[PDB]
Amino acid sequence: YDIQAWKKQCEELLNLIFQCEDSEPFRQPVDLLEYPDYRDIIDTPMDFATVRETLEAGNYESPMELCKDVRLIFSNSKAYTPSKRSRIYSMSLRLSAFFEEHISSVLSDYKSALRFHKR
Numbered sequence: 477y478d479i480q481a482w483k484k485q486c487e488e489l490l491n492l493i494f495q496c497e498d499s500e501p502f503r504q505p506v507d508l509l510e511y512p513d514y515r516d517i518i519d520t521p522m523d524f525a526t527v528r529e530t531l532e533a534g535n536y537e538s539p540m541e542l543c544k545d546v547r548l549i550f551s552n553s554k555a556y557t558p559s560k561r562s563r564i565y566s567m568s569l570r571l572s573a574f575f576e577e578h579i580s581s582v583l584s585d586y587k588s589a590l591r592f593h594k595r
């Protein structure tokens with residue numbers, strides 16, 4: 477029932493995501509010189525360095541907020557891909573499955589801790 481435990485759990489999951497070769501296209505903001513039309517399609521860029529920095533700044537109040545930003549990395553990849561068979565998008569799908577598999581217990585434990593706090 478530790479209400480704060482999610483933070484270190486998210487730091488550890490971000491460390492694993494950074495070791496994953498599938499995260500390379502998503503570690504830093506999409507290069508606007510490489511993809512000059514990016515901002516015509518994507519309204520809110522997001523990347524894993526921005527997520528890690530937001531967490532370390534103490535600017536996430538819950539793991540649900542972190543999850544919303546990580547899911548935005550994947551929805552941006554899906555919205556920008558010219559094809560559902562493209563390399564970068566294909567990497568995003570594997571990384572998303574890995575993320576969802578690991579974040580589920582982080583979210584469940586946090587929500588359970590908050591419910592216990594208000595028991």
Ligand SMILES: OC1CN(C(c2ccccc2)c2ccccc2)C1
Pocket residue numbers: 520536541542544545548
């Ligand atoms: O609390 C976290 C910060 N995330 C938002 C956000 C992302 C970038 C800049 C400002 C704010 C957001 C995510 C996805 C859609 C729209 C906004 C949710």
